[PDB]
Amino acid sequence: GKLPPGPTPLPFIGNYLQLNTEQMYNSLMKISERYGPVFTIHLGPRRVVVLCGHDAVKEALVDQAEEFSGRGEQATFDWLFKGYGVAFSNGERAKQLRRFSIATLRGFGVGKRGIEERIQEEAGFLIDALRGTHGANIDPTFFLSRTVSNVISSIVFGDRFDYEDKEFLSLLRMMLGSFQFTATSTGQLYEMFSSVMKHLPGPQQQAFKELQGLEDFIAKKVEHNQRTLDPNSPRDFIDSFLIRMQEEEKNPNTEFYLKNLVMTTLNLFFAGTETVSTTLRYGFLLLMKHPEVEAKVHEEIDRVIGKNRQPKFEDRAKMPYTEAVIHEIQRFGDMLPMGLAHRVNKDTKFRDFFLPKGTEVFPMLGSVLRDPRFFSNPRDFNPQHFLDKKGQFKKSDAFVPFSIGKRYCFGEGLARMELFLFFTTIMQNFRFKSPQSPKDIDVSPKHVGFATIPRNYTMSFLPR
Ligand code: HEM
Ligand SMILES: c1ccc2[nH]ccc2c1
Structure with a gap:
């Protein structure tokens, strides 16, 4: 092999002395x-x-898609998944579960009327909750995550959770907690030294405890489902998997067994929850920071959808400004700045380099979302990055929040529908009020590591 150039490393600690664990993106x-x-x-x-x-x-990722379709490490999550499940796995295993998860989510209305209806209804329940706060100052965090989580939960578990179910809230905290840890300094130090750190006291232990509790929950739901299974009428993602496992019992090489079931379900439940939830939270903060932008959005809502009927995904075609604002929210939000690690599945010649089989690769999505050749004010919140001179929506090949290539987020269709329906349906009803003036609202991230996390804040949902 002939790897790209880089700074000389020391034994074991690697390039530690030249990396800032508190902001690995900037360091890289x-x-x-x-x-x-x-x-x-x-x-x-x-x-x-x-x-x-x-x-x-x-x-x-795209030009040599097959070669770069392997999955690299993500130390915190690998602690739990250990190569099982659809996301943090490789080869035939990743292939099978991905092929299956995609077909099953579609079977349950993802990317169709079914789930759009599910989302519309849940969007409905959220309005009720926010209106029920009667303009009171609140942390929107769990109001948003309970709503977001109910959409994917409907698909994998069969039904939504009640907004007051305490275990449900408990699960949401484990997710927010463990996801956030990967964004911190210790979380990144863990990416380098996990073989030693998994045995030492620290926040990593709390994160593991949280991951274990989410897995415990899923195994419990799987057992239940198993005893009440009707192999002729699957009620959710778990049944469809159980059914598939049934059909594959004879095959001793099958990827469809319980462990993959529990982990794949967790992948869907977790990503289906924390991602969109984090983007909505960040979005509101940015909207209150740029009241002038929330304004032009209201005007497009009221003018195209009206103050009457609930928004529908189809409305996005007549709303380039809202679509721009959302894209810019995602671009700015830069959820997974260093992307999710890939790895080459064979000896690969890439540019003037030769990467041997198994070499890990970080596709720095954050550097694509902030590439100066595609965005003029990469470090600023500016909806114009997605609008042309005439004021129409303008795509950009640098918009890669969902990544690209063969391992691209297959939850993309679902996320954009949720992003569009919750943002629009929420602003169709309210105007956002911050207890601080737009000049003192800090929209810089609280943590940047595996993920980008927004600062904590409270707000008011006042009727328009
Ligand atoms: C704001 C929303 C979301 C963003 C920005 C996001 C983005 C990402 C990114 C960057 C990856 C890594 C892709 C790669 O390996 O190159 C990923 C993969 C994945 N996402 Fe999402 N995601 C979001 C929502 C969803 C939703 C709603 C689901 C649930 C169905 C989901 C399921 C997954 C899964 C299972 C993978 C792993 C795929 C594989 O390894 O082949 N995501 N996502
Ligand atoms: C991003 C993508 C897929 C995932 N599966 C579990 C957590 C998680 C985060």
Whole structure:
């Protein structure tokens, strides 16, 4: 092999002395700024090829899609999944469960009228909850996550949760807690030194405890389902998997067994919850920071959908400004800045480099979402990045919040429908009020690591 150039590492600690665990994105970008957009870095004992900018990322993930379709490490989650489940797995296993998850979610109305209806109804219940706060100052966090979570929960568990179910709230905290840990300094230090840190006291233990509790929950729901299963009428994702497992009992090479079931279900429940929930939370903060933007959105809502009927996904075609604002919310939000790690599944010639089988690869989505060749004010919240001169919606090939290539988020259709329906349906009813003036609202992220987390804040939902 002939790996890209990079800073010389020390034994075991790797390039530790040249990385800021508190902001790995900037540290890697600082290093890019001197070795090129493609370089080698050593996270502790892990050798990783980093890709920065739309071009390097796009050349690998899309132009050589098959070769870069492997899955690399994500230490915190691997602690729990250990190669099982659809997301944090490789080869035939990732292939099967992905093929199956995709077909099953569609079977349950994802990307169709069915789920749009599910979302509309849940969007409904959220309005009730927010209106029931009667303009009181609140943390929107769990109001948003309970709503978001109910959509995917309807699909995997069969029905939604009551907004007051205490275990439900408990599960939401484990998710927010463990997801957030991966964004912190210790969470990133964990990506380098997990072989030593998993045995030491620290926030990593709390994160593990949380992951274990979510798995415990799922195994419980699986057992139940098993005893009341009707192999002729699947009620949810779990039944469909149980049925598939039934059919594959004879095959001793099948990927369809309980562990993959529990983990795949967790992947869907967790990602189906925390991602959209985090983007909505961030979005509101940005909207109250730019009242002028929330304004032009209301005007497009009232003018196209009206103050009467509930929004529908189809309305996005007549609302380029709202679509722009949402895209910009996602671009700015940069949820997974270093993306989710990939790895080459064979010896690969990439540019003037030769990456041996198994080499980890970080597709830095954050550097694509902020690429200066595609955005003029990469570091600012500006809805214009997605609107042309005439004021129409303008796509950008640098918009990759969902990644690209063969491992691209297959939950993308569902997320955009939820993002469009919750934002629009929420603002059709309310105007956002912050207890601080737009000038003092800090929209810089609270933590940036595996994920980008918004600062805590309270707000008021006042009727329009
Ligand atoms: C704001 C919303 C969301 C964003 C920004 C997001 C983005 C991402 C990203 C960047 C990846 C990694 C892709 C890669 O390996 O290159 C990922 C994968 C994945 N997402 Fe999402 N996601 C979101 C919502 C969803 C939803 C609603 C679901 C649930 C059905 C979901 C399910 C998954 C799964 C299962 C994977 C792993 C796929 C694989 O390994 O092949 N995501 N997502
Ligand atoms: C992002 C994508 C897929 C996932 N599965 C479990 C957590 C999670 C986060």
